[PDB]
Structures are given as structure tokens and as C-alpha cells.
Amino acid sequence: LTNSEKSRFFLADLTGEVQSIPNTYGYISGLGLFRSAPQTQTTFLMDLTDWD
Amino acid sequence: AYQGFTKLGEREPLNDIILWEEITPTGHSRKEYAPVASTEYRVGEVLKADGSKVAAGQEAQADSVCIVNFYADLQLSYHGQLKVVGIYRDAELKDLLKLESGVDAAAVKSALKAKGIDFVPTGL
């Protein structure tokens, strides 16, 4: 159903196509243990207190 | 280079080491000093008569325990005051003291003990 190799006046078959999708991992991001804290400024502070 | 962290700083000591002192109409147990140039005072630092800190070998010259935080470049205390003050007469203070390098703590304690200052044991 398509042109052959090395000739234009003959025919050949395509018979589909294979694919190679890379490997992606999502275990840690799927754990959902990180809590989103959206903020406005470009730098956030924090003060640490520890009683003796 | 941002080497990973930014430390904004540590809080300066608060004036809470005074447990008991002879309080009168005026400052019987506290005296005033003229601040020395380019010298930073914190609470709990031992001072000599001239107003400088006690160094190694000068432990017997201990005069008072600073109870205010002074900023050398600003030349004002953290309470907006013009002069540094310290406890020199009879009083009871917490054992927390800030001494310089190579300063004998026991020698400083004995020198302040004779003037009337006692140091209650503090624990943690």
C-alpha cells in the first residue's frame, strides 16, 4: 500500500509502527507528603525557638 | 556562591539575669558608663572601671556586669539610651555570664563576689 524501497513503480506494505516512550517515575511525587505553600514574595523567612 | 543557607542572626540576650538587687530611689546597685568607641556590649558581659571588657589577665579588675545591649556603630542602646549601664554593687544574678577568650571564670566570680554580687546556679 506504499512505494517499495529503491523503486518507485512497485509497492510494499507498512504494517504499522512501533514506538519507544521513555521511562518516567512518580512514586515520591505520588506519595503526596509535600504540602504546597504558595506565597507572593521571592524570599520567605523562619524563626526557630528551642527552650532549653 | 549562595552557600546554601542564610542565617539572619541570633537574638541578643535579654535583661533577665537580675534575680535580686538593692533597689533605691536611684541606682544603688547599677552604675553608668561612657561607651568606648567601636565596642559592642551585650547583657551579661563583665566590664572594667574604664568601660572596656575584661580580658585575659585582668580578671581581678572586674567591675560590673552589663545589663543592656549597646550597638557600637549606632552608638545607642537597644532601649534608645545614650550610655551603657551595669550591676556593680550587691545583687544576685543568674550564673549565665559572657566572658572573653582565656578569661578565668572562677577569678571573675571571686572578684565580683567581694563587691557584693552573688551568682545563683542556673541549670539546663
UniProtKB/TrEMBL annotation, chain A:
It comes from the Viruses. This is Major capsid protein. It comes from Shigella phage Sf14. The chain holds residues 2 to 53 of 367 of the full protein.
Automatic annotation (TrEMBL), chain B:
This is Putative structural protein. It comes from Shigella phage Sf14. The lineage of its organism: Viruses, Duplodnaviria, Heunggongvirae, Uroviricota, Caudoviricetes.
